[PDB]
Curated annotation (Swiss-Prot), chain B:
It is found in: Cytoplasm. One of its GO terms (cellular component) is cytosolic small ribosomal subunit. Keywords: Cytoplasm, Ribonucleoprotein, Ribosomal protein. This is Small ribosomal subunit protein uS2. Belongs to the universal ribosomal protein uS2 family. Required for the assembly and/or stability of the 40S ribosomal subunit. Required for the processing of the 20S rRNA-precursor to mature 18S rRNA in a late step of the maturation of 40S ribosomal subunits. Component of the small ribosomal subunit. Mature ribosomes consist of a small (40S) and a large (60S) subunit. The 40S subunit contains about 33 different proteins and 1 molecule of RNA (18S). The 60S subunit contains about 49 different proteins and 3 molecules of RNA (25S, 5.8S and 5S). Interacts with ribosomal protein S21. GO terms for biological process: ribosomal small subunit assembly; translation. The keyword Ribonucleoprotein applies. The lineage of its organism: Eukaryota, Metamonada, Diplomonadida, Hexamitidae, Giardiinae. GO terms for molecular function: structural constituent of ribosome.
Length: 97, 194, 101, 82, 212
RNA sequence: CGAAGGCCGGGGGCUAGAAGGCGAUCAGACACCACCGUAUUCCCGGCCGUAAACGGUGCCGCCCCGCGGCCGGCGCGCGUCCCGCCGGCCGCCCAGGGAAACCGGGAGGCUCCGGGCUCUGGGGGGAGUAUGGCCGCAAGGCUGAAACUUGAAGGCAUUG
RNA sequence: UCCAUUGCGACAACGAGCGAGACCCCGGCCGCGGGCCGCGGGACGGCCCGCAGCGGGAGGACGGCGGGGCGAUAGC
């Protein structure tokens, strides 16, 4: 077991301790700077009915509301559900989204 | 003064918003939007110095001219056409200076490159077989394994063509081939890429 | 599902480059053309010859859409009658700090 | 000169070249070393045959890019530039 | 006979180059072993096989075995060389090692401990070398002292022309290839150390340069 | 002074939840999964003194190729910007170093070895054990052997 | 991308070789010769549309020919 990453697998810079979050899939405790974080904006009605709601609406000029959700998962759940992948040694250095 | 006017039309005097410490001596001012400007007098003195380095070699076919950039390709086949240097136009194949079994292998005495980040393989390979090098260098250039820089704009076609045209003219002047203090029969347009 | 091996292709390229004038883009004439020993071609079998000719015929109708090296050279040497070089805030400061201006 | 015998004879096989910039000895198998020469016109803008100046640079000065300024400074001391 | 593949080897074939020290003075690589063999005709070089090692690559069906051979050459009078070679058969590995040993010849500088009477008889001054974990110290010694070194180091010091030397070795010197590499590197640095004997400035005259 | 768990005496008590109970699964399941739940989790006054208490990297001082990001203070310039300076937190990296991974604001300036100070180690087990001492309400903590046994244990890296 | 380390194209690698394929045997359709056997022609991703090659049509005896033979380096 040598060192695998320069950040030790987290984003902790000039502090001793950080907050705890609960994984939204399995509910384990994870430090906040380690948890995998994604933000999503979606429509409350699925796009496959997004025009039939609209055509059956009495209010003139209505606009379909949206949902704003920040999903946070642990390492195990992120790998299992394919939010992140295991990468090659060269590829691990890439930070591009 | 006429060549100064040509340098102004080609804009051979504008950098790329970043400056290296070793090119700091060639800078004159900074444009507000961040672009740097070269002192053209220093550019001409480097051109003359490079010319006075090129003519020490008796046979010019042992000078290598390497330029991978498309916008310079035409310009390097004409520099040879009037000086008789040896051009390596496209992708430089590893081994050309170190591997004797290659078909285009050679053993030159001067390497002349166009850009130091493009054409990096030629510069790195020349350091294994004792070749000095001269490079056209912009404001962000890294001068590792380079002996003579030439401050200039090395992206726009007019700049590149006019630069090789000036170099070939001063070499043909120094050797005595073409007359001194008289405009060369060759128009610089023959160097610029259409 | 019929991929030509390098052996077909490498012979087909020398055949098309050497015999550009003889090869129409239609196949029977090229089948004859991959037969002569004067356009010297030692094809040791007729199936092999047919495959090579099938790739040669295809190479023919790709150059339409040497005659394209004479003109490329004869257009790299043309100097027009113009010269292509016939506002500043910081370079002005540099021409004053050099010469006449 | 080199190392001497007790009587006064140099018992050295060969003398390495010295760097024109950093005075360091070149040494064999230092294949990044370069020697190169400059024209020294002196004659109405035209060169004179077989009358040059010649400097040498070890690989250490090249590996960091110090030569573009040091060569210029060396030239400004020999009346080849300004 | 042999036809040169390089301009230097083409130049040596005629009467252009007089000795090895001109090729070392302007430090150029040597790519043909008959360039070396032209300057040392027929057995002024001693060639001795230091080591043969069996190396194994693991494979789906079983182990693949090859051999690695380490060879040193010298002339007892100021030249040493060290090469290595890998092959399926031992004979070819040794052949490759001997060729590589001939292309790696370097000159060695000698001097005087104390009295400067005759020929230089020991290292010119303290030398140090590193290879792998091995480190070596060659210390100048008086006359009659001999070559005080391990039997691996003593052969390299014998081929090099060094009569009197003290030696210290640190690291895992049982690894024979790194031992010989460290001693070789120490001998190779001998002509790159500034001593007051060499301070005097000189003019370079391009007429003598072999023009790379 | 010192996370969490733990202890003594008071208070409080939503949630979650060692222990315990119960439904499944399974050859078995005293576990993983479901459900219910005591101490605990929170406040006050004390005790205990340990964590992968980690950057697995002691403290003070000097020199050190460069390219960037962010935070605090200040100064010059044009017409918010822009260039610097000091202090902090980060990324990449030439040389140099190293068994290498890697470090590079040091893990550099070191077999070419010496700026100052404090602590710790000397093959693997036995063993952090026995014994004695000090501290603690307890749980512990700190200090800490020998007989005897053994030819390797271990690091980083390559191919399958 | 292909049945395929079959190929395009890119590259601190450049250039070769083996295995693959090509090759051999058989059988479909047509000619010259002999008296059915024995010598050749024939098919090639060749034509036409749609996007190295994947699709859809057509003619033709046969449509991407079909069934076999051979069979790398290293080994148990
Ligand atoms: K480990
Ligand atoms: K570790
Ligand atoms: K972590
Ligand atoms: K922080
Ligand atoms: K924080
Ligand atoms: K994240
Ligand atoms: K996890
Ligand atoms: K190099
Ligand atoms: K405490
Ligand atoms: K605690
Ligand atoms: K408690
Ligand atoms: K409660
Ligand atoms: K409570
Ligand atoms: K508990
Ligand atoms: K339970
Ligand atoms: K259990
Ligand atoms: K279990
Ligand atoms: K419950
Ligand atoms: K408790
Ligand atoms: K409680
Ligand atoms: K808690
Ligand atoms: K509580
Ligand atoms: K506590
Ligand atoms: K520990
Ligand atoms: K840690
Ligand atoms: K300390
Ligand atoms: K800030
Ligand atoms: K700031
Ligand atoms: K701050
Ligand atoms: K600030
Ligand atoms: K600030
Ligand atoms: K600041
Ligand atoms: K600072
Ligand atoms: K600072
Ligand atoms: K700073
Ligand atoms: K810092
Ligand atoms: K201490
Ligand atoms: K300690
Ligand atoms: K300790
Ligand atoms: K300890
Ligand atoms: K006891
Ligand atoms: K007690
Ligand atoms: K008690
Ligand atoms: K108690
Ligand atoms: K007790
Ligand atoms: K007790
Ligand atoms: K105790
Ligand atoms: K181990
Ligand atoms: K260990
Ligand atoms: K271990
Ligand atoms: K360990
Ligand atoms: K290693
Ligand atoms: K190892
Ligand atoms: K490749
Ligand atoms: K017959
Ligand atoms: K017959
Ligand atoms: K055909
Ligand atoms: Mg306390
Ligand atoms: Mg509850
Ligand atoms: Mg409950
Ligand atoms: Mg502890
Ligand atoms: Mg700790
Ligand atoms: Mg610790
Ligand atoms: Mg920051
Ligand atoms: Mg930070
Ligand atoms: Mg940092
Ligand atoms: Mg100690
Ligand atoms: Mg006790
Ligand atoms: Mg006790
Ligand atoms: Mg290893």
């Amino acid at each position: 077991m040598p060192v695998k990453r320069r950040n030790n697998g987290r984003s902790k810079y000039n502090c001793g301790h950080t907050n705890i979050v609960r994984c939204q899939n399995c509910h384990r405790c994870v430090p906040k700077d380690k948890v995998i974080k994604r933000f999503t904006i979606r429509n409350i009605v699925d796009n496959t009915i997004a025009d039939d709601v609209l055509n059956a609406c009495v209010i003139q000029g209505f606009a379909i509301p949206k949902l704003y959700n920040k999903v946070q998962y642990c390492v195990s759940c992120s790998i299992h559900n394919h939010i992140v992948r295991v990468r090659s040694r060269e590829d691990r250095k890439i930070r591009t989204p | 003064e006429a060549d100064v006017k040509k340098m102004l039309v080609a804009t051979t005097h504008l950098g790329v918003r970043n400056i290296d410490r070793r090119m700091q001596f060639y800078i004159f001012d900074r444009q507000k939007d961040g672009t740097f400007v070269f002192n053209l007098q220093k550019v001409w003195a480097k051109i003359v110095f490079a010319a006075r380095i090129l003519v020490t070699i008796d046979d010019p076919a042992e000078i290598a001219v390497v330029a991978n950039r498309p916008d310079a390709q035409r310009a390097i086949l004409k520099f040879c056409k009037y000086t008789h240097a040896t051009a390596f136009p496209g992708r430089f194949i590893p081994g050309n200076f170190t591997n004797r079994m290659n078909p285009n292998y050679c053993e030159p005495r001067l390497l002349l490159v166009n850009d130091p980040v493009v054409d990096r393989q030629a510069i790195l390979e020349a350091s294994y077989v004792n070749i000095p090098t001269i490079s056209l260098c912009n404001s962000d250039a890294n001068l590792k394994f380079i002996d003579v820089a030439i401050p200039c704009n090395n992206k726009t076609p007019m700049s590149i063509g006019l630069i090789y045209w000036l170099l070939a003219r001063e070499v043909l002047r120094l050797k005595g081939s073409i007359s001194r203090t008289e405009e060369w029969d060759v128009k610089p347009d023959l160097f610029v890429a259409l | 599902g019929k991929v030509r091996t390098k052996t077909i292709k490498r012979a087909a390229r020398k055949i098309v480059e050497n015999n550009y004038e003889s090869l129409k883009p239609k196949d029977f004439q090229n089948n004859k053309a991959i037969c002569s020993k004067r356009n010297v071609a030692i094809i040791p079998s007729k199936r092999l010859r047919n495959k090579v000719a099938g790739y040669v015929t295809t190479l023919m109708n790709r150059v339409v859409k040497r005659l394209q090296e004479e003109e490329r050279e004869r257009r790299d040497n043309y100097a027009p009658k113009k010269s292509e070089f016939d506002v500043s805030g910081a370079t002005q400061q540099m021409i004053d700090s050099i010469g006449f201006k | 000169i080199g190392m001497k015998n007790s009587s006064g004879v140099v018992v050295d096989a060969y003398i390495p070249r010295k760097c024109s910039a950093t005075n360091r000895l070149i040494g064999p198998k230092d294949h990044a070393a370069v020697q190169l020469s400059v024209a020294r016109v002196n004659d109405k803008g035209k060169m004179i045959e077989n009358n040059y100046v010649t400097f040498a640079f070890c690989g250490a000065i090249r590996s960091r890019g110090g030569v573009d300024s040091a060569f210029m400074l060396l030239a400004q001391e020999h009346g080849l530039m300004e | 006979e042999w036809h040169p593949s390089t301009k230097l080897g083409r130049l040596v074939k005629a009467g252009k180059i007089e000795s090895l020290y001109d090729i070392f003075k302007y430090s150029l690589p040597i790519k043909e072993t008959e360039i070396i063999d032209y300057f040392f005709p027929k057995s002024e070089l001693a060639e001795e096989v230091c080591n043969i090692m069996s190396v194994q690559k693991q494979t789906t069906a079983g182990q693949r075995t090859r051999f690695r051979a380490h060879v040193i050459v010298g002339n007892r009078d100021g030249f040493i060389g060290y090469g290595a070679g890998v092959s399926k058969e031992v004979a070819n590995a040794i052949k490759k090692a001997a060729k590589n040993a001939r292309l790696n010849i370097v000159p060695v500088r000698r001097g005087f401990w104390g009295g400067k009477l005759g020929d230089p008889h020991t290292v010119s001054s303290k030398l140090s070398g590193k290879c792998g974990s091995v480190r070596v110290r060659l210390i100048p010694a008086p006359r009659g002292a001999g070559i005080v070194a391990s039997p691996t180091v003593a052969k390299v010091l014998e081929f090099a022309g060094v009569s009197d030397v003290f030696t210290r070795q640190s690291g895992h010197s049982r690894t024979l290839m790194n031992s010989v590499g460290a001693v070789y590197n120490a001998l190779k640095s001998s002509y790159s150390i500034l001593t007051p004997d060499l301070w005097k400035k000189e003019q370079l005259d391009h007429v003598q340069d072999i023009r790379t």
